[PDB]
Amino acid sequence: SAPLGPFNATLLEQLKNDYQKGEKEVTRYIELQEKVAEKYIKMTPLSVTAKKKLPPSKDPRDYMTLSPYWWPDSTKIDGLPYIRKDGERNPEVYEYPERENANRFGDAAYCLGVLYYITGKEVYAKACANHLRTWFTDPKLGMNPNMTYANAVPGMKKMRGSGFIDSRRFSRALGVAKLIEGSKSWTPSDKKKLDDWATAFCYWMENSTQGQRESHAANNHGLWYEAIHLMVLAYLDRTDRIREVAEQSILPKMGAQIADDGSLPQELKRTLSLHYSTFALEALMEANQITSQIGINLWSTPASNGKVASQAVDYLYPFYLNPEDWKFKQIKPFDQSRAAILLYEAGTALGNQKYVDTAKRIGLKYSTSDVETIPYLVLK
Amino acid sequence: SAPLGPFNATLLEQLKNDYQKGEKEVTRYIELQEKVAEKYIKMTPLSVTAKKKLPPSKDPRDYMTLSPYWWPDSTKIDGLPYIRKDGERNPEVYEYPERENANRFGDAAYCLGVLYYITGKEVYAKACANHLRTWFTDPKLGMNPNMTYANAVPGMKKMRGSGFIDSRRFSRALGVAKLIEGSKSWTPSDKKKLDDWATAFCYWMENSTQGQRESHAANNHGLWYEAIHLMVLAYLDRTDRIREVAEQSILPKMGAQIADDGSLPQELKRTLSLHYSTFALEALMEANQITSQIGINLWSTPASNGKVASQAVDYLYPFYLNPEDWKFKQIKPFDQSRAAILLYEAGTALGNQKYVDTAKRIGLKYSTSDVETIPYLVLK
Numbered sequence: 001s002a003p004l005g006p007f008n009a010t011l012l013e014q015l016k017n018d019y020q021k022g023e024k025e026v027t028r029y030i031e032l033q034e035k036v037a038e039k040y041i042k043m044t045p046l047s048v049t050a051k052k053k054l055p056p057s058k059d060p061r062d063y064m065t066l067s068p069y070w071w072p073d074s075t076k077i078d079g080l081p082y083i084r085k086d087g088e089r090n091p092e093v094y095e096y097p098e099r100e101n102a103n104r105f106g107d108a109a110y111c112l113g114v115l116y117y118i119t120g121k122e123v124y125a126k127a128c129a130n131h132l133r134t135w136f137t138d139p140k141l142g143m144n145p146n147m148t149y150a151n152a153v154p155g156m157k158k159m160r161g162s163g164f165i166d167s168r169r170f171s172r173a174l175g176v177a178k179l180i181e182g183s184k185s186w187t188p189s190d191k192k193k194l195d196d197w198a199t200a201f202c203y204w205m206e207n208s209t210q211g212q213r214e215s216h217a218a219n220n221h222g223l224w225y226e227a228i229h230l231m232v233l234a235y236l237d238r239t240d241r242i243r244e245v246a247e248q249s250i251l252p253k254m255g256a257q258i259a260d261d262g263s264l265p266q267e268l269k270r271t272l273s274l275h276y277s278t279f280a281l282e283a284l285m286e287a288n289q290i291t292s293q294i295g296i297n298l299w300s301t302p303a304s305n306g307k308v309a310s311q312a313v314d315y316l317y318p319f320y321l322n323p324e325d326w327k328f329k330q331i332k333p334f335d336q337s338r339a340a341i342l343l344y345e346a347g348t349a350l351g352n353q354k355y356v357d358t359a360k361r362i363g364l365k366y367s368t369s370d371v372e373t374i375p376y377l378v379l380k
Numbered sequence: 381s382a383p384l385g386p387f388n389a390t391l392l393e394q395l396k397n398d399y400q401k402g403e404k405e406v407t408r409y410i411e412l413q414e415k416v417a418e419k420y421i422k423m424t425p426l427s428v429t430a431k432k433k434l435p436p437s438k439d440p441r442d443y444m445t446l447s448p449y450w451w452p453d454s455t456k457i458d459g460l461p462y463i464r465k466d467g468e469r470n471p472e473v474y475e476y477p478e479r480e481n482a483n484r485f486g487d488a489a490y491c492l493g494v495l496y497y498i499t500g501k502e503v504y505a506k507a508c509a510n511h512l513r514t515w516f517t518d519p520k521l522g523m524n525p526n527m528t529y530a531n532a533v534p535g536m537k538k539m540r541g542s543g544f545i546d547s548r549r550f551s552r553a554l555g556v557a558k559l560i561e562g563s564k565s566w567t568p569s570d571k572k573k574l575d576d577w578a579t580a581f582c583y584w585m586e587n588s589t590q591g592q593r594e595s596h597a598a599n600n601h602g603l604w605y606e607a608i609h610l611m612v613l614a615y616l617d618r619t620d621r622i623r624e625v626a627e628q629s630i631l632p633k634m635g636a637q638i639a640d641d642g643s644l645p646q647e648l649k650r651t652l653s654l655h656y657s658t659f660a661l662e663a664l665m666e667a668n669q670i671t672s673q674i675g676i677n678l679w680s681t682p683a684s685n686g687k688v689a690s691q692a693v694d695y696l697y698p699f700y701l702n703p704e705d706w707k708f709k710q711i712k713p714f715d716q717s718r719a720a721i722l723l724y725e726a727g728t729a730l731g732n733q734k735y736v737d738t739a740k741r742i743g744l745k746y747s748t749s750d751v752e753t754i755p756y757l758v759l760k
């Protein structure tokens with residue numbers, strides 16, 4: 001029975017079972033994955049402190065990024081205050097090294113922790129443990145447990161960012177640390193420091209003004225906030241909190257954000273409206289992987305007004321078959337492969353075999369190294 | 381009469397004449413540009429050598445970038461060889477500091493040089509000089525006069541790059557070096573070194589396999605090659621060569637790329653077909669800023685086959701009024717303001733008043749800091 005964490009636990013338990021039964025298909029797949037993982041063992045651990053331009057706190061351990069749709073104003077002598085262009089990522093985002101470094105850290109730790117659970121090999125736990133210590137708990141390299149300066153917007157006064165949805169990159173790795181507990185490399189003191197950081201980040205999330213605001217966001221940001229919250233609570237074994245969050249926040253949010261026709265109107269107004277409709281459902285999906293491990297199915301449990309998240313999957317399914325039919329603003333081509341994992345997760349959750357068929361027809365490449373597809377041999 | 385260089389010499393002479401005559405509308409405008417200039421005066425000269433990851437030569441003085449549409453192949457263990465995703469810029473490009481640093485250098489030097497020609501104040505010549513020496517001729521920080529490692533593709537190293545079209549950024553600055561000759565800051569020693577560099581770089585453009593290959597290109601890359609060629613040649617005052625290139629390479633190239641309806645088939649098969657149709661004419665427009673200073677008008681001179689640049693503007697002109705009508709693949713929005721400068725140059729060259737009128741209705745922001753608009757008070 002898999003420990004509580006940020007992954008489809010059914011798919012992981014069965015890959016581990018089949019790997020240990022020596023089944024030929026799974027064993028070939030896992031050996032492939034093991035070759036993909038090699039770069040993660042040799043990879044030097046990343047730190048949030050590897051930046052030159054410091055945040056207003058002057059502390060390199062504070063995570064800082066630029067809100068990706070905000071651009072210098074050509075008509076102002078210093079380009080301040082920045083102006084918003086929805087859907088156009090300002091390439092200055094890549095001058096803040098946390099942005100892509102949290103992604104690389106997140107990929108390494110997730111790939112290594114999963115392969116530790118599946119194979120048992122101590123070597124993967126050791127590499128995982130090394131990325132975790134440096135990114136989180138280390139007293140010089142470790143990241144401070146806050147997102148004060150995520151998605152800053154130059155020239156904005158109070159505007160205390162535009163969200164900390166960036167967290168999902170490293171908070172998936174936080175959840176995966178649960179998989180290496182009991183290994184020889186992850187000592188009891190390692191787990192205490194990490195618990196203590198997670199307790200401090202959860203507190204920041206629930207009590208800081210930026211946390212409270214993001215807990216009440218009206219679009220996919222509120223949904224991603226709770227997905228991240230659940231990752232942190234599940235790492236801390238706060239399963240009753242997980243139940244309070246789903247019933248008192250997640251379910252209300254879907255009740256309001258889904259319309260009667262199953263569309264997501266807060267996302268339909270974006271310049272990337274098919275992408276953000278999917279990005280909202282991607283949040284529910286990852287929240288569900290955690291909630292359904294304690295018997296709460298977020299795809300079919302209704303909100304108090306009777307709406308269910310499956311109505312929104314229903315609304316998008318035709319356009320996952322033919323994105324060209326999408327009739328709202330989408331100023332960049334939509335990646336259809338995002339529907340495979342999505343329809344497979346909603347599909348199995350609902351007994352909708354039409355969804356699952358379509359997920360496999362779309363499929364994921366067998367030899368892909370995208371770590372988020374490691375559990376999905378079934379789509380390969 | 382203005383020195384020969386990469387700019388609309390008619391607008392430039394005009395601004396300098398009116399500035400010196402104390403005309404109020406021009407003196408106000410030039411006083412705004414001087415405020416915008418102030419950052420370049422304080423700015424630390426940039427160098428191609430500021431990078432960690434070295435090129436195959438292990439020379440930091442070798443300019444090196446990644447070809448923008450080539451991405452890792454996630455189906456291969458080392459991501460190698462990269463695959464092409466037309467029109468999708470790979471954020472890995474920003475890990476090559478030259479790509480953006482050539483932009484910042486080019487903008488700084490262009491603006492200082494032009495303000496020195498217009499205003500005559502030595503402070504702009506002195507700052508321009510400091511950037512040109514550092515980027516070009518300094519014996520430690522100066523880039524080598526080649527583009528061997530521009531637009532490399534990892535894995536496909538077996539071949540070459542994908543062209544050196546990035547040169548336009550710093551070769552405009554090379555052209556504007558001409559405008560500070562005669563100042564106190566630009567010594568005869570300075571100008572001799574730059575001439576020697578321009579000569580070496582010119583040799584490389586014409587005799588290296590990568591230059592020869594690029595001079596043969598059948599699309600917008602052939603046209604940008606010559607536009608860059610003319611900038612170097614004009615800097616070197618080789619006005620006979622500018623005629624030969626104009627007459628034997630640019631017009632026949634332009635003529636081969638224009639269909640009977642005026643479309644540019646090589647650019648219509650691109651995922652950014654309106655951006656690339658416009659980008660081809662922008663090469664011709666910058667080429668023509670140089671050729672028409674010696675009496676060759678590329679907008680109205682027909683090629684051997686009877687095609688003329690004016691036909692390709694005609695095809696595109698409706699879609700500059702209404703870019704939404706564009707019936708070909710354009711997977712990112714198109715900046716309609718690019719049509720402002722393009723229809724004014726083409727229109728003035730052709731005596732087409734409807735083009736100029738539309739150029740001024742689209743216009744440019746009076747207070748913009750985009751340095752390529754500095755000559756275009758007529759549009760603001």
